[PDB]
């Protein structure tokens, strides 16, 4: 009977039924006998579900680090003590690995924390295991409340009506006002009342904040003028974090700069910032067809939200190392690099999702007459010109850049490195004068990133624009978003749908972010190791990368286990090998296609049906090879997983021994 | 030869259409005529469990010491548990009646019903566990 939310799949004798049923479990629009109100109610409950999952994930974080961590010892020395995350329990482990996995002064096999959670918790006020445990318990409580509310808001009495959901402008305004301004104000209040006094060296808790004294003004100027009294005595350059040495009395300042010891922003400045955010949001909360088409299609909202999330995630990734905001995080390079890479890849995936769901909207919810001569129909009427100009700019940025790289490469190879092509990054130097030092390599890498970015935009927008129709198939709307092909007729029509455009653009996204992170990691490793001239004189030609970064820094990671012994990086070497392997195993689905495998499976079916001791057992469903779209999807998943795993293993393997 | 009907996807090669191989296959517990499903399950369980004990106790991580035989018996019993779970979950879906073939002219009817499969699995579990424990105790006794 599975899937019950369909009839076409329920009558499929083959194994394709299971694959396609799992494929569209959350395609709530396509379930038979579905109404809009039921759609919105199920969406509400499912969002409650994802929120509860996030809360339980954070609760597990907190509980596991409180139970098996070393928070107190790391607090006693945040420079020469490595934080730990979860103890290791594997029966298949050996004795040598067990002895080699006892690190950071622990009493057994434990895995290290490479996300910088210790510094974040230290900054916000956590000072003991009890605080972490209470936080985990409260997170489990709130997750349970969220789950119960998700169940409750589905009951017939409490089920919201569709008209209530249709007030998209009202809910959006309520969001932007309350959920942002009030939350920022509450966080600022927590900061001022607890965190800053905690940093200054005095213990503050739930049993003391009622009778504590945040500022001698006593909230009096908050309803009057003389606001400057809140910053009458800031901290001192010699002030020691978590100590009363040079502790000030100010709570809301705008001094800026970096702390002399923690190398991060001032807590008073952060409180001021979230306060300015909160007041701006509170003030702004009360105050052709695009603004209504936004409220008409779900996929348009999803695409806009995903694009905004990706852009802000890239912004966060840049700022978290341009302007570190956590104490003792700029002296721990590994977590910084890991977080940068992680949120950068997340931002890329989010942007690709925005583009994909926008193409889905174009296929499904677009209407010609209701969206007549708006900002949207103009793009559809002139797709060819914009695609052509993208193709021109892509090739112009690519041909000459690759030529410059290979020309420098061949010129240096012949033993005459004094006649390369070096172009200075003048505009970056001007903006920095009016950060880091930029040379020709940085110029070339930023240009290559721009090239790959315009290319990925080319594929994404081409798919979005030609999703509705094209010259090959003037009726692509009737064929749905995702379909294999249109047969070998008309010269062959392989890999044509907009889903296939997403398929193509995913690889370019992976390449773009890969170049970005390669550049970032190589420059930062050159800086940290005290050898900057290496990057300056070895990044002009492409051969320097291979012999300096990839080969040069994959020397101790690759030595995780040797015929002589096992060290602490063994698991990362195993993950590295698994990464190349999982990347390689996707090539099967990428290259080879279905028909050969279908014939092979028919041969295997014959073999099974005509052998003794096995005809007694027969398949419930007739085996068939995976469909074309299934092959593409599974190959893409294996490819991406292998890529991510490989680069993460490389990053921790290369950076951790350095520190 | 064609083996009954040439149009059917079969061949009467001497590999499986020989008299001796036909007798040997049709006399196997899964195909033998004249016993209930429980006896079939029992014999199959003992045979395959007595097989399964060996490699676990031979190549295990503790193969050197005397705990190897206990580990092998336990692992064989666990595999028998897994296979019995497989049988009990396969019997529920009520699969189809197996058809006659070249080697077996008259296939058994004990594998065409839910209760038959359940009885076969019930016998198989006991047979496998008994075979594993018998192998363990025998291998211990022989060493003295």
């Amino acid at each position: 009977k599975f899937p019950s939310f369909s009839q076409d799949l329920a009558q499929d004798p083959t194994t394709r039924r299971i694959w396609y049923g799992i494929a569209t479990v959350h395609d709530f629009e396509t379930h038979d006998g579905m109404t809009e109100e039921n759609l919105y109610q199920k969406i509400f409950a499912t969002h409650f579900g994802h929120l509860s999952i996030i809360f339980l994930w954070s609760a597990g974080h907190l509980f596991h680090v409180a139970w098996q961590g070393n928070f107190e010892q790391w607090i006693q020395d945040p420079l020469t003590i490595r934080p730990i995350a979860h103890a290791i329990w594997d029966p298949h482990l050996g004795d040598a690995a067990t002895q080699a996995f006892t690190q950071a002064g622990a009493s057994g096999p434990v895995d290290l924390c490479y996300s910088g959670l210790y510094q974040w918790w230290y900054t916000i006020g956590m000072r003991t295991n009890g605080d972490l445990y209470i936080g985990s318990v409260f997170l489990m409580i709130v997750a349970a409340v969220m789950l119960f509310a998700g169940w409750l808001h589905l009951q017939p009495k409490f089920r919201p009506s569709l008209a209530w959901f249709r007030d998209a402008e009202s809910q959006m305004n309520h969001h932007l006002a309350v959920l942002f301004g009030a939350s920022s104000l509450g966080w600022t209040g927590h900061l001022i009342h607890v965190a800053i006094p905690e940093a200054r060296g005095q213990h503050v808790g739930w049993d003391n904040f009622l009778s504590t004294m945040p500022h001698p003004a006593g909230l009096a100027p908050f309803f009057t003028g003389r606001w400057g009294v809140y910053a009458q005595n800031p901290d001192t350059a010699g002030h020691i974090f978590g100590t009363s040495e040079g502790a000030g009395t100010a709570i809301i300042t705008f001094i800026g700069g970096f702390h002399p010891q923690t190398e991060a922003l001032w807590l008073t400045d952060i409180a001021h910032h979230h306060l300015a955010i909160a007041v701006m949001y509170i003030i702004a909360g009360h105050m052709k067809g695009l603004y209504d088409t936004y409220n008409e299609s779900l996929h348009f909202q999803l695409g806009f939200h995903l694009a905004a999330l990706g852009v802000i995630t890239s912004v966060v990734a840049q700022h978290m190392y341009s302007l570190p905001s956590y104490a003792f995080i700029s002296q721990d390079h590994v977590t910084q690099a890991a977080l940068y890479t992680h949120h950068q890849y997340i931002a890329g995936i989010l942007a690709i999702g925005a583009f994909a769901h926008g193409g889905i909207f174009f296929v499904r919810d677009y209407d010609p007459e209701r969206n007549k001569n708006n900002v949207l129909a103009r793009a559809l009427e002139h797709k060819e010109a914009i695609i052509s100009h993208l193709s021109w700019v892509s090739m112009f940025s690519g041909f000459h850049t690759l030529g410059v790289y290979v020309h420098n490469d061949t010129v240096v190879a012949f033993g005459t490195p004094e006649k390369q092509i070096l172009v200075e990054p003048i505009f970056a130097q001007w903006i920095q004068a009016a950060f880091m030092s930029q040379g020709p390599g940085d110029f070339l890498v930023h240009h290559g990133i721009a090239f790959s970015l315009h290319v990925t935009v080319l594929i994404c927008v081409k798919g979005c624009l030609d999703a509705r129709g094209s010259k090959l198939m003037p009726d692509k709307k009737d064929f749905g978003y995702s379909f294999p092909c249109d047969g070998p007729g008309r010269g062959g029509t392989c890999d044509i749908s907009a889903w296939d455009s997403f398929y193509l653009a995913f690889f370019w996204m992976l390449n773009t972010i890969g170049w970005i992170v390669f550049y970032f990691n190589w420059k930062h490793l050159a800086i940290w190791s005290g050898n900057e001239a290496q990057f300056n004189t070895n990044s002009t030609y492409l051969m320097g990368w291979l012999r300096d970064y990839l080969w040069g820094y994959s020397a101790q990671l690759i030595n995780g286990y040797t015929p002589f012994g096992v060290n602490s990086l063994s698991v990362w070497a195993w993950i590295f090998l698994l990464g190349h392997l999982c990347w390689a195993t996707g090539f099967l689905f990428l290259i080879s296609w279905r028909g050969y495998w279908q014939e092979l499976i028919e041969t295997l079916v014959w073999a099974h049906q005509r052998t003794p001791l096995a005809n007694l057992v027969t398949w419930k469903d007739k085996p068939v090879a995976l469909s074309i779209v299934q092959g593409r999807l599974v190959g893409l998943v294996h490819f991406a997983v292998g890529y991510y795993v490989t680069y993460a293993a490389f990053v921790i393997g290369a950076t951790a021994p350095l520190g | 030869k064609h083996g009954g009907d040439p149009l059917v996807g079969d061949l009467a090669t001497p590999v499986n259409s020989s008299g001796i191989v036909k007798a040997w296959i049709n006399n196997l517990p899964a195909y033998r005529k004249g016993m209930s499903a429980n006896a079939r399950g029992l014999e199959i369980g003992m045979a395959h469990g007595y097989y399964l004990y060996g490699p676990f106790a031979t190549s295990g991580p503790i193969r050197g010491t005397t705990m190897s035989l206990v580990s092998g018996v336990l692992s064989a019993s666990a595999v028998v548990i897994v296979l019995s779970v497989a049988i009990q979950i396969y019997s529920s879906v009520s699969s189809a009646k197996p058809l006659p073939s070249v080697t077996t002219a008259d296939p058994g009817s004990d594998f065409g019903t839910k209760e038959g499969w359940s009885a076969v699995g019930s016998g198989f579990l006991i047979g496998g566990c008994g075979g594993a424990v018998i192998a363990g105790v025998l291998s211990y006794a022989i060493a003295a």
């Binding site: 599975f2 299971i18 049923g21 329990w89 029966p91 419930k620 | 779970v85 879906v93």
Partner: peptide, 28 residues
């Protein structure tokens, strides 16, 4: 505080077995 040995083999092995058999019941 020997919950690792009690819990991890349980939640991995028996958890996966129960989930797999339940899903197998579900798809028929």
């Amino acid at each position: 505080d020997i919950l690792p040995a009690i819990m991890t083999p349980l939640v991995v092995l028996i958890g996966g077995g129960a989930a797999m058999t339940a899903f197998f019941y579900y798809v028929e």
